[PDB]
């Protein structure tokens, strides 16, 4: 679906510097221009397409997708992507054992929900100023952490990831659980934990956005189906 | 296919390493960080201070194109060296243009000599030149209306280390660093030098054609010990500095900044 | 299927309405009984629908 030219324009073909590479990414690498590794778009594209297809399929059976990206450059974008296809996301720091330790985190989620309710639906007001402030702070904290996953209910049936090396904890958790992983994997990253590897530039913003958008579209399509 | 191979050598052909090809489109502005995309592996974290012109406010919105620089790749994450140096090459080209007709004409306005040559400033940048260059004869711009308008007629340039002394008024008139290290020597010759890296004891301003200066922590200001040089001056900025000391042997020119 | 949504939204409306109708009568009844265990009229009008 996503063309090669577009990818090139975005800056998918660019990778990291040669000294920071992983030799498990040697198949997906093409060459090294100006001492910086170039990802092979001929090998990338089909894989990407396959991944997209898989995602679509998942969506079709009413699968829950989780969008992970805690880089802070593409935190805004990932959330947007998630919301477009009304799916869940973790745009700020992944809580260690979010999925493996769901049952504890489900309590946190519940608490957050309660807080939200108190804030909005109650309309009681009349609260001690320090206490109120504290409550507000707590709410903020919760929202930041678990805002995207509050309506997830259980565990997701697939896990889309913007960087494998950065979100290794998440990936590991997924592996432990047995959730399919759809990771964007730059030359420095490790592809071994990832099920459906996508060789591409995690760092560049435009590229990331592109990666998101197609995925979102596919999810939407699946839903429609 | 070989579509991609050919596309790779094509994209090699349509970029170069320095800040030469004005290619990065400014794709997000936020104070205090500009950011471009010149067809590199990542986006630059640009300062705002490489892009405000001569009175302090910004000049370029979204879509605008300046080249940056290169030859340094990946400090962890990111891409460039700053586009402002880019600009230096353009300045060099205009200075070079003189050679063709033996006269580069702009405006040069030089009020005084930090180190024996009036300072001339062209557009945003200000440069320092050796003392003769400011005046064609013995006229002296001290009697001229302050910060006067002429041009610059070049008197002397050092060709390696960048010092250029230029000719105000009189329109009618028209191994290597260390052997002869006696030019900026004699006790206190002021220099204009860009700082490079501040090593928590130092600042490392070093400009004059492959040398190293320190301005370590003791002077820097008029407080001694509590100063922490990163707070007090800058990173990458051309400043007031002069020699105070040269050892041509254990190459330690020990500059100062409290002057 | 056009009328399907009409009846669909109708049921919920009355369902909540009736509950609210009793809720209105119950809310008043709560305050009505609120005298042997808190008659503070100015200390009973805290949260509205919470």
Swiss-Prot record, chain C:
Domain of life, source organism: Bacteria
Disulfide bonds: none
Task performed by this protein: DNA-dependent RNA polymerase catalyzes the transcription of DNA into RNA using the four ribonucleoside triphosphates as substrates.
Family under the similarity heading: Belongs to the RNA polymerase beta chain family.
Subunit structure: The RNAP catalytic core consists of 2 alpha, 1 beta, 1 beta' and 1 omega subunit. When a sigma factor is associated with the core the holoenzyme is formed, which can initiate transcription.
Record-given protein name: DNA-directed RNA polymerase subunit beta
Organism of origin: Escherichia coli O157:H7
